[PDB]
Amino acid sequence: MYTVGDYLLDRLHELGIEEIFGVPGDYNLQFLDHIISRKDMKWVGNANELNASYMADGYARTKKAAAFLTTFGVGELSAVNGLAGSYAENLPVVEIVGSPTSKVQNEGKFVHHTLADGDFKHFMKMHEPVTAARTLLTAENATVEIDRVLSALLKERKPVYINLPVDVAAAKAEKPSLPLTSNTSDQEILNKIQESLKNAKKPIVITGHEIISFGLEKTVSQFISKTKLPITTLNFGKSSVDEALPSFLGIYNGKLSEPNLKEFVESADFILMLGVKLTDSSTGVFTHHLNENKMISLNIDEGKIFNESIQNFDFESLISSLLDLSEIEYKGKYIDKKQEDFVPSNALLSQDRLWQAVENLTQSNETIVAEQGTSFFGASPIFLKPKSHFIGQPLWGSIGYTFPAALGSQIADKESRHLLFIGDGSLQLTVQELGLAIREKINPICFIINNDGYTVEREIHGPNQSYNDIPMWNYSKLPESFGATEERVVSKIVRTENEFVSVMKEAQADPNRMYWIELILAKEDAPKVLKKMGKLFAEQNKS
Amino acid sequence: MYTVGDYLLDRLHELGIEEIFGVPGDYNLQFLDHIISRKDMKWVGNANELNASYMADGYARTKKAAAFLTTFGVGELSAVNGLAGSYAENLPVVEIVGSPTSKVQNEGKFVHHTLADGDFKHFMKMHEPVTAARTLLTAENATVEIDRVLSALLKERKPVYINLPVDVAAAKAEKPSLPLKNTSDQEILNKIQESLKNAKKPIVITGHEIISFGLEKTVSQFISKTKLPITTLNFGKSSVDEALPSFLGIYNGKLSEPNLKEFVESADFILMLGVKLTDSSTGVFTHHLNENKMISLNIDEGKIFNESIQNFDFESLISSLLDLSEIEYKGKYIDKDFVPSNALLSQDRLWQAVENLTQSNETIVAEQGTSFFGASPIFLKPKSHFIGQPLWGSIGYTFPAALGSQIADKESRHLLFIGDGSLQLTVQELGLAIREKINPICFIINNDGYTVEREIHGPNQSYNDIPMWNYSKLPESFGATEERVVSKIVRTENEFVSVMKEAQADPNRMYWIELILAKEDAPKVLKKMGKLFAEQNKS
Ligand SMILES: Cc1ncc(C[n+]2csc(CCOP(=O)(O)OP(=O)(O)O)c2C)c(N)n1
Ligand SMILES: Cc1ncc(C[n+]2csc(CCOP(=O)(O)OP(=O)(O)O)c2C)c(N)n1
Ligand SMILES: [Mg+2]
Ligand SMILES: [Mg+2]
């Protein structure tokens, strides 16, 4: 018998979702039976709901849609920081919240996971600022309301929220019969882009996170490969293009950019900015020089043609229509590439040498995931090899995000080897999903930067203050504690450059096990970029 | 120079707060220096902010006030489920949120921990339904607004929220010169006195709002003097001294012990103090508490024989019960030994053993699951306390909460009963427990997944399974040797008795006790309760 629950799961299938994350509770168990029963969809239960929301976000970055299931009140409020991060960085995540029967809600009963005030609407209201759309389903409205909020997910690629009462999930439904000025405005915009690109001596394309949101990376890469246009990205939307393309210049990060890149971008006679938002961590704390007078910018929500706002266009089809532009070919030069061989010594591992080694040793078909801290500042500038991706969260910047997110992205694409760089202080927030990693038998390479506390915080304020210290776990021993054998997870401790090179190669050569690699770094050691960034953060926070 | 931050910390000191929980971020480090500097207050840094909010709640249950510190956006939104629990069960917790400089907020800058829309007010608005009061401080308003929201905390004993911009924390202030903070009261007291005077078989019921205000000792003095029959719900368990001769046990609707159920439901007058009737605390609304013969008093409102009353002071009204003369119950109460074998541990025998072996001045903390349903009916010894969260019911709460409460009172031995499934949500505060060298006795019910969920729906469904960790190996992984944390695995009744006594006899180390129970085994109460939850969700 086909139910409202089955209608919702059919629509999630249509979005490309093959795994649902989350945590059970009595208000969602009956719905959960319908996930278990489906051949085309797998329940992947998390230890906690914050982790589920991070994991769904990571999944969405790779699969280009995601869903997780929570219980009313305690589940959804545990996950709201993850949904806020999906809203900030524009990932298409559906949160399903199982709620009490409409009878219990209508009677205002003082049931578990409420404030005992008979009000079942507080928690949906609290989601208003971090959802593109939200609904409390009834038997009557269910199929239309499901389709309205998932259509908002398709239009905006921002998160949405479905409150699913137990009885409403179980109610009868019918399978969907339909799939989930502007065009003239789209054409005027395309014509102006074509004309600016035709006439430009030194154009620069800048792509950002909204390209990733819509799954447009391969479209951008096809566009840049055919046209030979110079391209840069911010660290917000890193891997929005294939970084191995010859016209990829590197990561523009305001005054912290490599000088040749900085000179090229800031001297360009035309800027085409696609899906970019300029944030403190992505602009060297607002030290960028991007002249709007010589810019066409396109975003999901709005655009700017040489400083004139435009509103009525379709972002996705406009980007796709760049592949139709004829008579576009850049004939000029790019910038110097000087990549050195990394030659290890027995020297103690240092931040600058670590990121040199990672850049040298990364392979094609990898996804690099980097946590806020030394890892993001060290890894974000690295040139990726072909067929590769990057996950980082520089705008929301929620530490711990990257561990469940890496696992969710790894589940989304089994054929991309995930390399996670996470700090000791960040791993402590989300460590419990090591249980899920073991159960799912996924094989990411996980590097823990053990520098005895919060080095990025030490670099901003209070380098010797006790609040920057954390309890030192035995990080390499965690897999065994969480139930792994050496047949599943290989643990390592690394102290030297020689060890780092040996262990990274060993891990990459063994795609059939998860690697759990504890890196020992000095608490005083920060990558060259973070040395400068820490003082710019402190200035931004000057009292 | 004395700052707005110093003003806030002086007011928190006045509330009896000696420890501040939370997680640093760039938006709060400069304020945090002021906590470090204070001789009278300790920074106790958590692994994550949800755990900090749970730990502050547990601290508030024992200390009767608490505070924790988060960073703007990512910290505060991580903690909002803990603050919602503190709102639901009425605990006086202050959340301090360090935010960007007013210059950055005023300029609408696209900075980290925002939605890059220049709006710095979304997250404070999202707290409106789960706070008694909230404020965004300015240099101008700081001292008035700090005093306003902490006054709300004193009046309501509900959580409050202070957004503290970097520059506003650092701004000049002057030390406070005084510390912070009728006919209806008398009418209520007169009607209570008259009903108690005339009653043949009165019952007093106390609940969680007594705990909120720290009125347990007042209620205990009132019951000891009057000899009045008293029960509590499992929501507000330990709102009275359970060792008092007139304490009947826990009333839980039709799941009550029969002698207690018969007594409560035949009482000719009911006095409810600080009670809320919730599904988990009434045997899923199978209580029989005739409002025609009831006076109920709550923080926000009262009922005199089904008539609402509004304008009274809950705290002083409870205190004024000690003045009632010509109250002495002259009637009877109800009728109220563990021999272990080598038999495998079962749920029912476990909770019989815990009741037998618990000692005076212990705090029992019990997680939603077999632990709460098993432990909540247990008769406590003198000077004992209980923490459970049956209304909000957020699994994982109890591990950080037990550590918070243990920090709040180092002289009460904390016994935590937490399920395998619940421990997985909040396990990282084992690091804090090791660092702080606190000595709670932690029992982990390893029954290979979510037994309470199996008892409600889908006992054989894979969603009720969890990854089996090596629970006994966690303390070593998190940096404890046996000098700090003693790890044990228990399978038999004889092992359980030996290990619980050994833990109680060693107050100088933390115990980490893995209990092996069958996934199919549930306490007597939960066998019945599970089907009542399932019926409440009947589609
Ligand atoms: C949820 C959350 N809480 C707090 C912060 C503030 N924060 C920014 S980076 C950081 C420290 C990260 O330390 P670690 O992961 O050890 O990195 P590293 O030592 O390599 O810099 C903290 C606490 C945050 N960004 N997110
Ligand atoms: C934060 C949160 N997520 C989900 C739930 C739903 N829930 C209630 S009890 C429970 C399982 C508890 O399992 P465990 O701790 O193993 O207890 P036991 O097996 O002894 O019953 C779950 C998932 C909840 N109450 N809180
Ligand atoms: Mg670190
Ligand atoms: Mg269990």
Author numbering:
A (entry chain BBB): 1 to 180, 186 to 548
B (entry chain AAA): 1 to 181, 188 to 342, 346 to 548
Task: Provide the authors' original text about this structure.
In the synthetic isobutanol pathway, KivD is used to decarboxylate ketoisovalerate to form isobutyraldehyde, the penultimate step in the pathway.
We therefore decided to improve the isobutanol tolerance of LlKivD. While the structure of a fairly close homolog of LLM3 exists (88% sequence identity), we decided to determine the crystal structure of LLM3 so that we could have an accurate model for designed stabilization. Although KivD-P2, like LLM3 was rapidly inactivated in 8% isobutanol, we observed greatly improved stability in 4% isobutanol, indicating that Kiv-P2 had better solvent tolerance than the LLM3 starting point.
